Symmetry: C2
């Protein structure tokens, strides 16, 4: 099969002729700790709120997000998943010319194509280990309207250094280029604040955030966009679709942000099991594992003519094939980092495929 996004367990299970609950999914990167306790309680206790429309202005949710980031509520716009925020920014900025970095999340290109923009692709290089380098600076030109970066990048998991991002931000300010930073996974990286704390003096920077992966609520759909340009955000708001965020997602979001132990618990797990996982994967023969900073890792299979996703699916483990990402080929795959036990089943499966081969 050829799926545009991971997490397609129903489709994968159908390919094998079995029930989705029989697959162990490593193709979507959801926090393994599961749904925050308080969130589950809040949903059960306030389920009747679905009998009314959500607040079209999402006052409570926006206030919660603003309190969390200590920024004016006017700088924030919640969306039906960060995927909606990507389409919102693309349609609201309507760039004539925009640059994206490949490989990267497919939706940037989809949103830009539909908005009628001329798309330029800045290609990351295998020889550079897929890292974003300062070579992109010379590629930025006055005629560019937007530049979209993913920090960290999906699927490589690599995080551009702060100095390089500042240099890019500064050149964009100077060349009148809007800089959109997709921080969907920034919460997972222990010491990483992102750019929200620097928007006050940078109205040309837009930050995309998601709550689905970090708080394990991808099924609720919730993300948001943050920007300090009063006029531009007003435009995003008046052009938006009404009631995009469902009432339970708004509730879960507000509650999730109250859990003051969640961030630490997640970072500890990533620091312990996540590092142990990277290590074990690197020990496997015929496999290159890139140093991802969040809860997923890009793998490059060195074994010739072998479909790792097909072989692991036979063992009822679903992984992401990155062959469809521009710039990557059939040797590349991506796996989530999950609980130790689940990670152990993935490793044992990879070993059967890669161990004892000349």
């Amino acid at each position: 099969f050829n799926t545009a996004h991971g997490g397609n367990i129903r489709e994968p299970a159908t390919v094998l002729g079995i029930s989705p609950d029989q697959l162990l999914d490593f193709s979507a990167n959801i926090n393994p700790l599961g749904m925050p306790v308080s969130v589950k309680r809040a949903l059960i206790d306030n389920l009747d709120c679905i009998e009314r429309y959500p607040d079209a202005d999402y006052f409570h949710l926006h206030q919660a997000l603003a309190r969390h980031h200590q920024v004016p509520a006017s700088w924030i716009l919640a969306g039906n998943g960060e995927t909606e925020s990507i389409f919102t920014v693309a349609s609201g900025l309507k760039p004539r010319r925009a640059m994206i970095v490949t490989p990267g999340f497919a939706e940037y290109g989809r949103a830009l194509a539909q908005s009628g923009c001329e798309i330029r692709r800045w290609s990351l290089r295998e020889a550079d280990g897929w890292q974003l380098t300062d070579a992109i600076l010379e590629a930025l030109t006055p005629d560019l309207d937007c530049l979209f970066l993913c920090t960290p990048n999906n699927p490589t998991g690599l995080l551009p250094e702060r100095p390089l991002l500042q240099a890019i931000a500064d050149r964009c300010k100077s060349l009148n280029i809007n800089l959109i930073l997709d921080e969907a996974f920034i919460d997972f990286i222990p010491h990483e604040t992102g750019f929200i704390p620097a928007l006050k003096d940078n109205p040309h920077i837009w930050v995309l955030r998601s709550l689905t992966k970090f708080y394990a609520i991808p099924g609720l759909r919730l993300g948001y966009l943050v920007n300090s340009d009063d006029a531009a955000m007003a435009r995003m708001r008046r052009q938006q679709m009404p009631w995009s965020v469902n009432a339970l997602a708004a509730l879960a979001g507000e509650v999730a942000l109250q859990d003051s132990a969640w961030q630490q618990a997640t970072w500890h797990w990533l620091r312990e099991e996540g590092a142990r996982f990277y290590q074990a994967l690197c020990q496997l023969p015929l496999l290159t594992v890139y140093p991802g900073r969040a809860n997923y890792l890009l793998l490059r299979c060195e074994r010739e003519d072998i479909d790792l996703q097909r072989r692991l699916l036979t063992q009822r483990i679903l992984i992401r094939s990155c062959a469809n990402y521009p710039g990557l080929d059939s040797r590349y795959y991506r796996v989530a980092i999950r609980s130790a036990a689940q990670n152990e089943r993935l490793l044992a499966a990879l070993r059967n495929v890669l161990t004892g081969i000349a």
Copy 2:
């Protein structure tokens, strides 16, 4: 205040300086019976499904909708509320020239404007009691790409006769005009099948449906579009935003359609309390009440210089002001039809404002 849509209880309460739970809302038209029992159970029992992304293809939901209408599943596309279905059809059909009927739901014009279409408005007339007449047929011309009708119309509640809709449908087929029928409230009208049963031989007809009002789940956000043109629907699907429908909405939708007593219970209430409500409203002096067919009624206040919404809000009852609808003015308002008790509070409030006045 000037709200684009009703149901704005948080905004209304803020205007008065009180909590939203202190207002009785007649400005949104949600089934008063509340959430179907089975739906509530299903949500509570399957709450953990939000830990995974929804099925991007919504296999189970689409199969349920197809079984319900006895049509191929390929003819259906679920959306994040019928509002999303309106934007989907507008963006997917990208009409160069389109006609809408005013007054009508505001989102048609919003979706068309953003899609860059030349909008023509067919004006309903106060002298006709706001009924759609065959005069529109001569207004249809070959250069039209789309014609959007609301059946029944919002806010008038009037349902164009089947013969007129067939005549419009036939002329559209002949002039190569796509006909989009918004059946959001068709479920409330006792003997009304809508056009889904006639799409097989009419690929130029698109039907919009909503589950939020009839099953009282506006907070979950769920609607869908139905059309029999294989190629056109394929286009709507490949151009769509991924995971638009949240997992709980998909679950509620499937379950709600299983309640075989819901339709009857709702029609009975509308036949009893709804008729008694129309009658009581007509007895009030200085007030014209249009004969709405679903769960809402358009009111025209005959009392000079009186803001009925402002006066009722002082009594903690929120109603819809239709002054913002093109074609209507400050004399027009809309109220939901709710439970007998709630309807009794609205009537007593209207009486204090309209009774005993020369």
